[PDB]
Amino acid sequence: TKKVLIVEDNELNMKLFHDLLEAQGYETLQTREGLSALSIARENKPDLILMDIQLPEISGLEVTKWLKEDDDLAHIPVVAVTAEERIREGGCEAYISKPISVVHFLETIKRLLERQP
Ligand SMILES: [Mn+2]
Ligand SMILES: [Mn+2]
Fold it and tell me: Binding of Mn(2+) 1: at which residues (predicted)?
């Protein structure tokens, strides 16, 4: 089963993302903090990271830089959740804007998670 690490401080958004991903048969890991996301990634090896760029304590883009600096985490695709240029340059594979489109969101994540090994 593929696992998606969701980094989102907002309860409503976290629940929406979790519900949508669970419906697809994916397992999820959850946290509201950028630093914790790094720790969790090293302890549970997620297959994709859904990163809110607008976290209250830190920029998700700075967290993404730390991910790319780690030899074990650099390969994990990161999808930014923003409220394209900056995100792509930051190391994110794609971006999802809010209000999010359910189909666009799922298509984007499946495209990155479901490809021949
Ligand atoms: Mn948020
Ligand atoms: Mn669940």
Answer: 8-9, 52
